[PDB]
């Protein structure tokens, strides 16, 4: 079918067949020896294997298409003057429609991160936040969608002042380098090393000061699992990491962060992000308020991340203490904003890739980034 200017037509209605557009497909990187992998996108044994998980790939694609159309729409109206809340509500309303939100079967994978300046991630406004987007602000729009738990974790950076251009370019190039180096049997530490090489190859000048872009060392990429945004493996963006290898059938979020500060982040500001620990099982709770809140989370989010605004919209009131109890019990983990030093600028770019038996698919790739 056809999408209305302001996106409103759910993605599955634009593809009645049930088959969604594939992302960018690439040949796996050749081995150190010089061994090519073009045989994978050919081997009958791999082909059947890949086709066997087609429904899965397809679900990732449905979510990726939603992500592509939502972000394009956002890039058309995001502007200084708007509050962070106005920005997140407008984005999420469109996302809910295009993904055709349906309980845990289809919806938003996590809250809309819109971290500003020295803060690189995990910031989304809570109720009452009067923060307004400024002309010189560098905002990281990081939002996700999912179908049946197949998560699309994709992100980009927003600026209005050209002075940040090379900084954005550096991080974008670094993220793309990480995407190219990634592959079946590729060592994670090699990906991180390669990413840092590109990142540090860039130098920038902002308001009279020059800087060699630094990747944020304590931030990183990660493997993705069903309903588990952080499956267990990590993709470093600096050298010195694990020699652990990426494997066939795995899904990864290739994300990098560049900064003009220390290249290190720390918790800062009021927490807005929360997510149930995946490994913790059922826990009996008598405390009335804490019990109800946990039930609401299990029903509406499962192991998917959420924020306070999402609790508010569900009619929940005065739940902070109950939420703190859940955190203290280790049932829910808080994810406060991660920021570099005051006055520093940070940028981010992220894509979700599928390590298919036949090829490497950058499922969330768009004509934008
Ligand atoms: C240190 C470290 C840094 C980043 C990551 N992964 N990625 C992220 O957190 C972002 O790209 C996610 N979209 C945001 C989300 C991830 C789960 C917890 C709530 C916030 C994992 C570890
Ligand atoms: Mn993300
Ligand atoms: Mn991520």
Structure report:
By secondary structure, this protein is α+β, with helices and mostly antiparallel strands. It has 2 domains: 55-262 and 342-365, Creatinase/methionine aminopeptidase superfamily (Creatine Amidinohydrolase, Alpha-Beta Complex); 263-341, Arc Repressor Mutant, subunit A (Orthogonal Bundle). The chain has helices spanning 44-52, 54-77, 84-98, 165-181, 188-199, 288-300, 308-312, 320-328, and strands at residues 24-26, 106-116, 119-121, 139-147, 150-158, 203-206, 209-212, 214-215, 221-224, 234-235, 251-259, 266-267, 273-276, 306-307, 332-335, 338-339, 346-355, 360-362. The strands form 5 sheets. Strands 1, 8, 9, 10, 11, 17 and 18 form a 7-stranded antiparallel sheet that branches. A 3-stranded antiparallel sheet has the order 2-4-5, covered by helices on one side. Strand 4 (139-147) and strand 5 form a beta hairpin. Helix 2 runs antiparallel to helix 3 (84-98) and helix 6 packs across helix 8. The chain starts with 23 loop residues before the first strand and ends in a 7-residue tail after the last strand. The relative contact order is 0.17. The structure holds ligand AO2 and manganese (II) ion (2 copies).
